[PDB]
Amino acid sequence: VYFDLEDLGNTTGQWDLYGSDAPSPYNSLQSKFFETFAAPFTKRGLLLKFLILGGGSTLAYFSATASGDILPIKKGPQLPPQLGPRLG
Amino acid sequence: NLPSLFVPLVGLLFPAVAMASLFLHVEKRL
Amino acid sequence: GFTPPELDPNTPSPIFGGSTGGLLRKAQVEEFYVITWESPKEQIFEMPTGGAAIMREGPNLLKLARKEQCLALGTRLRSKYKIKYQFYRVFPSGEVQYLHPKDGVYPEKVNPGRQGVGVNFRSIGKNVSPIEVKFTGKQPYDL
Amino acid sequence: YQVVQPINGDPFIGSLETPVTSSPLVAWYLSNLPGYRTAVNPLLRGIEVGLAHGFLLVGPFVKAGPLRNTEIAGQAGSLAAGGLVVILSICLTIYGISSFNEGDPSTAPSLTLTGRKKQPDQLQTADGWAKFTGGFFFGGISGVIWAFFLLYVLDLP
Amino acid sequence: PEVKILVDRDPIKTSFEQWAKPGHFSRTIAKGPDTTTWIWNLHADAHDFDSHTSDLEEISRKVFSAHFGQLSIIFLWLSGMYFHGARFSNYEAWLNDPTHIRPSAQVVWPIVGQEILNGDVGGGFRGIQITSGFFQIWRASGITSELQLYCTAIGALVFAALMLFAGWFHYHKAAPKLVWFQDVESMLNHHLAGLLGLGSLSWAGHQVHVSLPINQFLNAGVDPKEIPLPHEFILNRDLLAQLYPSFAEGATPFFTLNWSKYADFLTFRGGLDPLTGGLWLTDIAHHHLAIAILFLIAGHMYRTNWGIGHGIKDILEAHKGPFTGQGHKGLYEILTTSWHAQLSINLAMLGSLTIIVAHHMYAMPPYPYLATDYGTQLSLFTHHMWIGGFLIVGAAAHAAIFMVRDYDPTTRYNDLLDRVLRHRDAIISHLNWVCIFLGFHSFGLYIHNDTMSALGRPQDMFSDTAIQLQPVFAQWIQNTHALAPGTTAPGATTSTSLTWGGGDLVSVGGKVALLPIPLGTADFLVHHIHAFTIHVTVLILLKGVLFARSSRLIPDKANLGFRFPCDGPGRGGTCQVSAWDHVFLGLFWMYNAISVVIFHFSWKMQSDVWGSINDQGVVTHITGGNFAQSSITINGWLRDFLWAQASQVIQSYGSSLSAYGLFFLGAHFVWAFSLMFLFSGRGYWQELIESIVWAHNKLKVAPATQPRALSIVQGRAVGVTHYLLGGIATTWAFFLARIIAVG
Amino acid sequence: ALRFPRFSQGLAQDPTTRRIWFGIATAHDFESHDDITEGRLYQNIFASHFGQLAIIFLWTSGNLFHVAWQGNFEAWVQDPLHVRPIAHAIWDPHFGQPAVEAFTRGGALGPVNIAYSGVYQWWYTIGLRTNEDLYTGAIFLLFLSFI
Amino acid sequence: SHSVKIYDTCIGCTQCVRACPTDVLEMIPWGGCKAKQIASAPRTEDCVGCKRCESACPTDFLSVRVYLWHETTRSMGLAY
Ligand code: CLA
Ligand code: CLA
Ligand code: CLA
Ligand code: CLA
Ligand code: CLA
Ligand code: CLA
Ligand code: CLA
Ligand SMILES: CC1=C(C/C=C(\C)CCC[C@H](C)CCC[C@H](C)CCCC(C)C)C(=O)c2ccccc2C1=O
Ligand code: SF4
Ligand code: SF4
């Protein structure tokens, strides 16, 4: 039935509409490849520290070692400075 | 040279760490 | 003494094609409500959530998401049609809680088995100034 | 005969069944996406989602970024895509930290559209989501690297 | 079952007794005022007929007489227009030099120095330049002397009298019956063939006898006083044959089917007449003839009393599919019971039609010397746009009213409407997402361009010179239009409009009339802005309509009425949940859409079309083609459009345009005045009026009608009314000053 | 308590997003927080005053530091009416080359903003003359913010 | 949940209970007024705060008072 005080998951529609529940289509060897090389990244706390610090240091490297050919802010002004309305 | 290190450190890394840490504290339960 | 009717599952529900105003995850993990009524015949009635539904003849059961939806539908069942109605609350555990009509008598009709709750015995303007309840967990109306 | 029917035969659940929702092509295709493979190690599903999204993100950043016309460094704009994967891997990580606790079970449905009992998807578990973030990150950076690895004999490089 | 005339005799007595009783129509208002709120309600419920009674017949008769009163007022307005053209105008001087004379039909009295507004308009006339375009209409019709305008004004006054009398008659005397109003088939038959068909035929008959010959003589340069009277073309057909030879036959090719002879004055040449700048009058007369035939045929679809014909009920019921259930069954009973449903449909369609008129009249100037009167054209376009927008908002309002008051599935059910209600959530969520996507992908591009131009990166903008977003589809469509004459339109001699066909620039009197309109990245961005604003307006109004009865927040919203403030501070807060407040917000958003539309029109016309043409063919536009580079930026719209073109209105003091300079600031004032109401609530104002009442009662001068602050709904109504008035009048003054000075 | 905000149980037990907003907007309303007393009220006010003073000292300290580092104070003393004082330096990677060109003024090497607070005239009138004097005042105020 | 209180100025017209859309008010017997009945708020956990009861009280000043307090899922009117 649709209203059953026993199982309220079926009464309130707590179903899996598009869940397959089938076995893995990913063959072996391939999965073990990813399960051993993506293994240290599956500690959410360690991944969080690794992402923040690693990403921040990566950003700090590419920002501290920027180039004038890439960023106009590092190239600086190439023209002689202008003259203010009255002052320098 | 120092702006090339501290400007991203306060406009990118600092808000990233601040928003993530405040998110964890606000959503935390006891 | 009054005994509330227990909620009987497998009770027929009105004919309806379905609408987007129905239950959500709140019904799955938080709570939902169920209103029941008798009705004499097959009729059409406006749904408090969407369009129109066909009220089945004989016992009817209708599950809604909010309590206000139940009382609003019940009030229309009592006005347009002449139908008595009850509704309950259902927790995800399967427990059922009877709500209205609490005494079996409608709340607008005085009933001798009722106790006072939150009834202050003074004029509304006789409350105290907020300074007299400062640094306490009190309010000038809780007393 | 009508096409639109209530969601799984229940009219009082807030949804409907339409060719967009309930159709053999849509049902099969969604049931075969890695996010809906409720019986597979979430690390692998993360690898696939990460590989697909990291590969896709390189295109817009390279072709629309600031260095797009400076072909000396525009191809390296995949770094921006890689940085977003890093940021998204943080968003994914911080999400699971707040959503699921260590000892908490799965919050996924333990039922089927036909009523039979089912084993809940381990993705809505703390360790399952951690594997998905780790898989999405590994596949993500791998998708960005593999996309940048290709560059030539394409009409929009 | 047999369509026939049905009226009642003397249903309501004619007396002044109910004149002297304010609020007689309402049962609560008739007791007189206890507080001042009464005074407002009397005007708010003055035209709410279906709330005064529940009898559909009384309502229908009231509506009929109200229509007659409206027609009387419109005829009085037209009488005033023609009379001012005859008595206080320089139309005879504009008729001799239409390219130099400014059209004027209002002269002010000299009392407090306002005679400065009587500016030099040419032809020895001091007055106010008019932009309504009545001069162009009167010239196209063939009117020459002030006497004909006098006679037209007198006829319009007589017709206003007739309409007023008929309004009194069909309510107090022979008042029609309900079934008479409900004979929809007969009514649509008479409106398609009798009203529109015979009307188009009558106008085509006038155009082939008066407009064409008199306008030929006007184009030839003949003096209007030396032009023969129109009726002289109906007596001596030699006069008509000397201009159009086919009139020498005498309706013989029409009956013998040799219609190819009539191609002299019934042509399909298209484009514009290069002497006047308007569409070829022969083409317009041929058009009205074709429209007359089409409508005279269409007025026979619906059955009445002779078996043949359709019944709309069957046509509706027969249209049901697998997605919509038994759709359309029940709609015939709905649309023959609810006035508000018909009003919603007709307001929507008439407003969209007014917008279509606004486009078609600028792209295909129908009247002679209209295309070069830049003031008249801009004013006509903007006015019709505003009319259409308001009417569509009203369509939304009355749809919601029907939902609240006339909808009932237990009596008059319809499957389509019920299915729409059963997924209003999906509809509104999808429209919401579309609106967000369009807001990002139109205005966000403007913000991108502003931030790139400010950072010294003009190549990282979205421009015709940088990242291009060409409207390829519209360009290809206008190109296909350009090549249609002679291919997919062999009878057409030139293009449908001049904005299509490449080349073929028409100019009149040193000013350009029309030329091919460019379409670039700016046009793309602006069109997407228009789509986005239209979508958000539709979202507001439709969401108000669909959720008028019930919602997850308030499941009994229909009981609260169509027009109610809120339902309390609870549930987090329930302010502006009524459908009325949805119309209230849709007003602001319709304003926000139409304003951008008309600003687009103004800048485009002043940049890429309107201007001065040389003797050798050098065209310099009013603004130097600055639309492509300046309008792709918000700062460009602020600087190169507002700041630059508001000069005329902020410099008009001391000239005949100083009234526009005054209205500019006055409309600014009332617009900001609305913000007091829109930002505040009536509780504070009532608490202030309390102390003011203390002050009054201290001096024995407090009124019996206890003062009360405006209602919440009235607060919002006043706010939106003043906001709209201020904004629209500001743009009105700005546009008129700018285009009359630089035109 | 149990979660944010720890000072309001009714806000913490809010199941909606309203919990966060009202937790921020009521952080300094000490009298409405749970289990507040007259002692805790005056004491939190006292410490908030010290924190404010620390904010003010740190803010002025930073102003001195940038005027002494990227500013014009030493050059401005020589020409008080012909030198545009410098607030700080601009380092925005979104700048185009012309943005770097047009913003390089006041006699600096990179793009700079022209200070419009009047601290140059203020500091010159009170006796500060060299960038070294501004560095000394910044350290003292940084130390004052510390105490 | 929102707090609701009934003061003894109540005349017992049962109007607050009729206007309540979530069945929070009740009519209990009393000896103070003529109708032998006063109002009470035993189910403020379902109270939404619409103040539809205060809009219907004929007492001056009001005899029903709704003091909006700590918001809950029930008091916010959420169906989700
Ligand atoms: C409230 C005072 C203040 C203010 C408003 C600023 C503002 C600014 N500083 Mg600065 N700074 C300050 C004090 C201040 N600073 C102090 C006391 C020092 C040490 C002497 C520095 C050293 C410094 C350097 C080396 C640089 C800047 C730079 C900048 C600019 C870029 C933003 C940035 O990098 O963040 C500021 C970065 C810092 C390291 C300063 C934070 C450290 C001090 C002790 C403040 C304490 C922070 C604390 C953890 C949280 C404070 C609480 C709250 C008040 C914010 C910016 C306009 C960069 C620039 O020039 O842009 C082109 C740059 O290169 N600052
Ligand atoms: C307030 C601090 C701040 C800073 C320091 C930057 C800095 C930068 N922005 Mg950004 N931006 C900001 C705020 C900021 N932005 C805000 C608030 C907005 C919203 C309006 C934007 C919106 C914005 C847009 C739309 C774009 C930028 C772009 C850029 C880059 C252009 C310069 C360049 O070509 O470098 C080099 C260009 C590269 C592609 C190299 C990328 C640099 C590496 C990959 C960084 C590595 C990230 C690291 C691993 C993880 C970082 C997060 C971590 C701290 C958690 C630059 C590095 C542009 C861009 O990113 O180019 C695609 C651009 O498209 N910004
Ligand atoms: C341009 C906008 C605007 C204007 C004109 C006003 C005007 C006024 N405000 Mg107001 N206010 C505004 C915006 C505005 N506000 C906004 C945005 C807010 C934030 C919500 C407020 C919030 C606010 C508060 C809280 C209060 C006021 C008050 C007042 C009144 C002060 C009394 C006074 O100065 O004498 C009169 C000044 C005038 C400008 C009146 C001009 C209109 C004259 C009478 C026109 C004459 C009529 C003429 C015949 C035209 C014919 C019209 C025809 C159609 C009939 C005054 C009428 C205070 C008040 O009520 O005073 C007791 C009050 O407490 N305002
Ligand atoms: C050929 C027949 C005919 C014609 C010409 C009209 C014309 C008109 N009808 Mg009408 N109608 C007709 C038949 C006709 N109707 C039939 C058979 C029915 C069903 C029984 C209706 C029911 C109906 C309703 C319910 C309404 C109209 C309305 C209108 C007016 C619409 C406003 C407008 O378009 O302004 C244009 C103005 C003009 C075209 C000026 C010409 C007006 C002339 C003088 C009227 C002559 C037509 C009239 C039917 C002849 C009888 C009058 C005679 C006894 C003196 C319009 C003048 C609306 C209305 O009442 O407006 C006041 C409206 O509410 N009609
Ligand atoms: C043929 C078109 C048409 C018709 C017949 C109706 C008819 C009706 N409308 Mg409706 N409406 C329309 C178009 C129309 N509307 C449009 C285009 C809009 C969009 C703005 C609306 C929006 C609307 C709303 C929101 C409401 C109605 C309502 C009503 C009903 C009551 C009308 C009333 O008594 O108000 C009385 C009229 C007044 C009090 C006059 C108000 C003064 C105006 C607003 C400002 C005047 C400015 C003026 C144009 C220029 C300034 C001059 C000044 C300086 C002197 C009534 C049956 C009301 C209702 O209750 O529905 C049942 C309702 O609330 N309408
Ligand atoms: C300038 C004032 C303003 C603005 C910006 C908006 C903006 C918006 N309104 Mg609104 N409105 C306004 C005034 C305004 N309104 C007023 C005065 C009223 C009273 C009548 C209304 C009444 C109203 C209603 C009734 C509705 C809206 C809706 C909307 C949204 C439409 C969806 C959209 O366009 O997505 C796009 C977003 C924008 C166009 C805003 C600018 C976004 C920029 C360009 C992107 C920048 C992003 C950047 C990276 C930020 C990061 C920086 C970081 C460091 C913080 C939109 C966000 C509708 C809605 O809810 O959406 C469906 C709707 O229902 N409005
Ligand atoms: C020394 C001065 C002083 C002090 C000690 C206080 C102290 C207090 N005020 Mg108060 N106030 C002050 C001045 C002061 N005020 C002034 C000058 C005003 C006029 C603006 C107000 C108006 C005011 C109001 C209306 C209220 C208080 C309230 C309060 C109490 C609680 C404040 C709170 O916790 O909310 C926290 C405050 C915030 C979270 C600030 C957030 C809002 C800010 C303005 C947004 C920042 C602006 C913008 C985003 C930044 C720039 C934009 C960027 C792009 C550059 C508290 C005891 C509240 C109260 O408890 O009433 C009983 C109350 O409602 N104050
Ligand atoms: C100002 C304001 C008021 C007060 C506005 C009032 C009271 C308008 C009425 C003012 C007029 C001038 C009173 C009518 C005076 C009579 C015409 C008699 C005058 C005598 C002769 C001069 C004609 C509100 O009531 C209100 C309500 C809700 C939201 C915002 C507001 C709001 O902002
Ligand atoms: S505020 Fe509304 S829900 Fe609460 S007691 Fe009053 S009427 Fe009932
Ligand atoms: S509305 Fe007021 S007077 Fe009437 S029963 Fe309720 S509390 Fe008593």
Side-chain angles (χ1 to χ4, degrees), chain A residues 2 7 9-10 12 14-16 18-22 25-26 31 34-35 37-38 41-42 44 47-48 50-51 62 70, chain D residues 8-9 21 31 34 36-39 41 43-44 48 89-90 93 96-97 100 109 111-112 115 118 130-131 134 137-138:
Chain A
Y2 292 111
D7 185 18
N10 208 73
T12 61
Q14 197 176 14
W15 312 303
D16 189 358
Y18 303 96
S20 185
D21 198 57
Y26 310 143
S31 300
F34 293 110
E35 283 159 3
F37 292 145
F41 301 152
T42 58
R44 55 183 194 176
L47 183 65
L48 187 54
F50 155 77
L51 286 167
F62 283 88
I70 298 181
Chain D
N8 207 19
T21 59
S31 296
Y36 278 142
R37 296 192 170 276
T38 63
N41 189 23
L43 199 162
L44 310 171
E48 176 176 340
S89 299
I90 301 173
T93 295
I97 310 270
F100 331 106
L111 277 77
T112 311
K118 185 179 167 296
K131 297 181 184 60
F137 171 78
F138 193 87

Side-chain angles (χ1 to χ4, degrees), chain F residues 52-79:
Chain F
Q52 173 79 88
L53 292 181
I55 293 289
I56 298 180
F57 293 149
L58 180 71
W59 158 66
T60 317
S61 170
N63 299 345
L64 301 139
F65 178 80
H66 290 93
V67 176
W69 184 25
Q70 315 163 337
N72 263 339
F73 190 77
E74 285 188 347
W76 183 91
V77 165
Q78 308 306 302
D79 295 292

Side-chain angles (χ1 to χ4, degrees), chain C residues 13-17 37 41-45 47 52-57 60:
Chain C
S13 296
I15 297 176
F16 190 55
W37 73 91
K41 57 176 293 185
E42 271 204 23
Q43 290 161 323
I44 287 185
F45 70 107
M47 196 88 76
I54 293 187
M55 175 190 318
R56 282 183 192 171
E57 185 183 352
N60 279 261

Side-chain angles (χ1 to χ4, degrees), chain E residues 432 435-437 439-440 443-444 447 532 536 539-540 585 588-589:
Chain E
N432 186 96
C435 289
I436 301 184
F437 165 82
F440 281 142
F443 171 74
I447 300 299
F532 152 73
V536 178
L539 173 66
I540 301 161
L585 300 172
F588 296 98
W589 260 91

Side-chain angles (χ1 to χ4, degrees), chain F residues 116-138:
Chain F
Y116 292 130
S117 59
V119 296
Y120 277 66
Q121 299 88 330
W122 178 33
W123 291 338
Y124 174 66
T125 309
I126 58 185
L128 302 169
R129 292 292 179 270
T130 57
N131 291 326
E132 169 177 81
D133 308 3
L134 309 179
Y135 282 113
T136 307

Side-chain angles (χ1 to χ4, degrees), chain G:
Chain G
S1 299
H2 299 336
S3 292
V4 182
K5 296 298 177 178
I6 306 304
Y7 299 86
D8 65 353
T9 64
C10 167
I11 64 178
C13 60
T14 75
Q15 277 305 326
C16 46
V17 194
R18 296 181 183 276
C20 190
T22 56
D23 180 54
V24 178
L25 268 294
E26 269 186 351
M27 294 305 301
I28 76 174
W30 189 46
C33 44
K34 211 167 300 179
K36 307 302 178 184
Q37 49 192 148
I38 203 183
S40 65
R43 296 178 292 278
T44 65
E45 60 272 11
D46 301 321
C47 178
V48 294
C50 58
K51 296 199 170 194
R52 214 180 290 189
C53 48
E54 299 183 347
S55 307
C57 196
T59 316
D60 179 64
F61 194 55
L62 294 180
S63 300
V64 178
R65 254 320 188 179
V66 188
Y67 309 99
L68 314 175
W69 202 241
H70 298 166
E71 305 288 341
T72 60
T73 297
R74 308 214 178 111
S75 68
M76 290 287 294
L78 306 160
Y80 58 101

